[PDB]
Amino acid sequence: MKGDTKVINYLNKLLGNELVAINQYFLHARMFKNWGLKRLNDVEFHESIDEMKHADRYIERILFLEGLPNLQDLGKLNIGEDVEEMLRSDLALELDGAKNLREAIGYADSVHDYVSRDMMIEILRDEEGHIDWLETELDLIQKMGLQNYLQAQIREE
Amino acid sequence: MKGDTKVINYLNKLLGNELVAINQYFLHARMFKNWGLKRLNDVEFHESIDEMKHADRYIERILFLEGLPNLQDLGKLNIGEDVEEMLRSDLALELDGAKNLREAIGYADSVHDYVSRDMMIEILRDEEGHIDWLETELDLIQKMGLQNYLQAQIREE
Amino acid sequence: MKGDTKVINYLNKLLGNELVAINQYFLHARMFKNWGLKRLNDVEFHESIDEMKHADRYIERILFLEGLPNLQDLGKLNIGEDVEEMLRSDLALELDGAKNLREAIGYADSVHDYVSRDMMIEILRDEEGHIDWLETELDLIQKMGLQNYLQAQIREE
Amino acid sequence: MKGDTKVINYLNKLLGNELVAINQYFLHARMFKNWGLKRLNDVEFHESIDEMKHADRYIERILFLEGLPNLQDLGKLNIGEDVEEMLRSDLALELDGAKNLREAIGYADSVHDYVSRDMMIEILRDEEGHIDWLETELDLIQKMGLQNYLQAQIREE
Amino acid sequence: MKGDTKVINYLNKLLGNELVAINQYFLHARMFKNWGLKRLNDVEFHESIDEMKHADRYIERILFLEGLPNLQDLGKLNIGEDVEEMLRSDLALELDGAKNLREAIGYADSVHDYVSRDMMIEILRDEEGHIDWLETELDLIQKMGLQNYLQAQIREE
Amino acid sequence: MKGDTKVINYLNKLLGNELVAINQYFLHARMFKNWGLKRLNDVEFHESIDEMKHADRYIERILFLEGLPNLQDLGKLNIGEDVEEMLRSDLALELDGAKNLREAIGYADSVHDYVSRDMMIEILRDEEGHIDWLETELDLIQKMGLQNYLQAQIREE
Amino acid sequence: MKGDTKVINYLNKLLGNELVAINQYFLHARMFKNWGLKRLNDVEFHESIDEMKHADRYIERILFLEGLPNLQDLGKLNIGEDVEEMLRSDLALELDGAKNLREAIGYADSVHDYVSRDMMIEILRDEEGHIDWLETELDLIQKMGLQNYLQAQIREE
């Protein structure tokens, strides 16, 4: 069913955001795993899977609307070298992605693609959940100190 | 069954105390939850429910005694913005409420409302339990330090 | 995640509505219970719990958005002393709350807080359900007469 | 298998009757549901489903006999505005349909379409069951009065 | 609860669309069944049931909003005589219905009937699913040829 | 445990190959899904997951050997526009990856990194399995004709 | 089966390494147990068991190849007096053992004893696992501090 060209361009942009996040979350998870921070490996791995599911939704929607999903152009990763830097980078990526989602959701409504909008609002809800988790972890590092925080990650939850 | 008017007035005063505690404990719980302190969310939420049960008992007793439960007047909440301050505020409210319960229990005996007295003694036992918990948690903060204390709240017990 | 200040103000206004409804529905429930109208106690108690769940959603959303939930200010309760008056009071409160929800939902869209909007639309759906129930019960009182209506409430459904 | 043209015409006429009844029973059911008359919603919904099954049997039989089922022409609905009016309209429709069935059953026999006749006799038995129910309900309204009758519908049976 | 008159008119228009689709899908299903194309009977029957569920939602919503559901006026069916014609007719109907839904969803938002809008977006999501299936089947006929396509329909999936 | 620099460089090269394959297999799967070729969606999705598992092993090994996994640079995808083109592109990618694996396996042996070699030989065994599947499917098109081949993909196996 | 004399000599050298590790890991485990560090007792005990399994494999392979297993000559143990010293000693022993394994694996390949090589590569994979664990624990001591690290060992994982 032929979709709106600009909506498709938005969906590809958002798909691009998800592709960056899949890779960044996955590498972060395995860095945490290497360091023995099992709890962080578990959550970050889950977050990577969440972004994979989002990517899947975008790919399927773009194809339905007769566009071409772009999985070729990968945007900049920002890995970081310690736990705080890594979590802050993930948070910054989530916030940038949320800005893009808000713009796309408004545009989709303007051209009456209400199903694409519905899909995007559900994805935005998930992303705000990730933002909540990341913000909370970063605040916990400050409150209990890094040494206690790291100790709290070595066992699975 | 028409009860003693002054007893009913005490029951409304005690109900008023419970209404403040329900809101204060619930807001505290969700603040702890937002901060990732899952254990404190669980206990404080449970405390809010316990106060709801007490409020229910007062409401049902007042109605049986043919009085009018007052759920309109809400006393002062003292929320606070750090864990120790929040727990100290809950403790202060519990101690104030216990004073009122003691007065009401004595008065109920003097006019032979032994069933209202029995109910209030059970509630006072519950409140002394909350006081014990709050006092103990506050002492633990002092003894192990806030950073260790916070670390100990992140996982559910 | 810092949210839109006016959205947060709407969320506090809506929370305020829920706080009134929680108390009004709960007191109504226990009045019905005292009168032996078990069915009405059950439904109104359930309605009180539903409003508690809504209040929880507002509190958690406001905290995520870095606002301060207001549980201190309690609006006017309208209790009433006969079944029809009580149900009409609940209906009036629901209709007033629905008006406020519509305003908030429109505003949230205008500032692109699509997740708060989604949450509020789900809550509005719940409230229209309560409105439907209340309207229907009031019409049943008229159609079968209050005496038959009361008889129909004494056994739990 | 090429059937008799006039038999197929009768089957299309009867299909037409069923299409009217499906819609009338279904709207009545949901009107009863809106009014809180759960028992009447349940029975009338089931009667709508019964007529749907009858329509299915006519459609399949017409296609087997190499005719063209007519689902395009919809006869007059008579909805009504109160319970007695609605039930009386349903009864009138059933009686009109039974008249048509009797004519078709006789004709099918005369041209030796015994399988179509067998199908129609089964459908007629179902319709007489609906007639019995409707007549009985209408008599109950008179015997116990409308107020009692309505009270008797508010719980599912 | 009194709804917006134009919203109710939209809901009746959409209901009318569903009523056409129910009949068209159902007759198509039984045509496929008569021809031994079991897979197509199964899917098209399921599609007819989907549209019945949509019609139910419209009827209930219209009644809640104190309007009068119109089940009397049935729009034009376009049946078709072979598989490709039938599927293309279903697709054209779905696309026409989607146009009407988009207009209604925009209007509902403008008068703040957010619950009616939410319902319609869910229905539109269902309709786009049907469109996807129909488009895909029509393309399959082209890719593998009609004879192979028909062979693939004789068993249930 | 500090690894050999050139081994780490090989592991990053192979990781790169896996990253291209994950995306190409996944998009191919969803193109097949869009087209209704459920069998091909299922297998190609499974292959994408297999390549994700391979990427995970490379990432974990690189981190153990104290290197930096490179998930930033993404090589050329060759998507294709029809089933045969897509399968041929997947086969060419697998063959190019197998060449790189053979070179890496020989080199790892030469510097005595027998555990990296063991890992790579297992991955190569998996890749030869994919090559077998792709070659077999392409030959099936040749043997039965494209239309028969496509028909054979519509049901899940 | 008459084995290669130098292969047997390598297997005896590696067996010697395992015999030292069995004793060192076991004594370390029980020192940790005495100190109340239950988690470290558990892991180090399991490491001792793993080395016993390795020793068993060498003994059985040597006997198959018609050589004489040497369990008489025990190399130098380096016990250590505190947690960090103990773990560093285990790490040093593992690294020395891995050096010997790499030499043996290369030689076995060169004289075509591929089954001894296969066995040794599996053992080397196990040893690299131990190395990973030891490195990770030593880094955790630095990152969370010794006091936190010790606290984290008192409960079984």
Numbering used by the authors:
A (entry chain E), B (entry chain L), C (entry chain L), D (entry chain C), E (entry chain D), F (entry chain F), ...: 1 to 157
In the authors' words:
Ferritins are iron storage proteins that overcome the problems of toxicity and poor bioavailability of iron by catalyzing iron oxidation and mineralization through the activity of a diiron ferroxidase site. The capacity of cells to store iron in a bioavailable and safe form is a central feature of the strategy nature has evolved to overcome the dual problem of poor bioavailability of iron and the potential of the free metal to catalyze the formation of reactive radical species. This function is fulfilled by the ubiquitous ferritin family, members of which are composed of 24 subunits arranged to form a protein shell surrounding a hollow center. Bacterioferritins (BFRs) constitute a distinct sub-family of ferritins, found only in bacteria, which contain a markedly different diiron ferroxidase site. Unlike in other ferritins, the oxidized di-Fe3+ site of Escherichia coli bacterioferritin (EcBFR) is stable and therefore does not function as a conduit for the transfer of Fe3+ into the storage cavity, but instead acts as a true catalytic cofactor that cycles its oxidation state while driving Fe2+ oxidation in the cavity.
The EcBFR ferroxidase site is flanked by two Tyr residues (Tyr25 and Tyr58) that are ∼4.0–6.5 Å away from the nearest iron, and by a Trp residue (Trp133), which is ∼9.7 Å away from site FeB. BFR also contains five other Tyr and one other Trp, which are located further from the ferroxidase site. We sought to determine whether these aromatic residues are involved in coupling electron transfer to oxidation of Fe2+. Site-directed variants, in which each residue was substituted with Phe, were generated and the mineralization activity of the variant proteins was determined. Y45F exhibited an initial rate 50 % that of wild type BFR. X-ray crystal structures were determined for the Y45F, Y114F, and Y149F variants. These, along with previously reported structures of W35F and W133F BFRs and Y25F and Y58F BFR subunit dimers, showed that the substitutions did not cause any significant changes beyond the substituted side chain. EPR studies of the EcBFR variants revealed that Tyr25 is the site of radical formation; only in Y25F was the Tyr radical not observed.
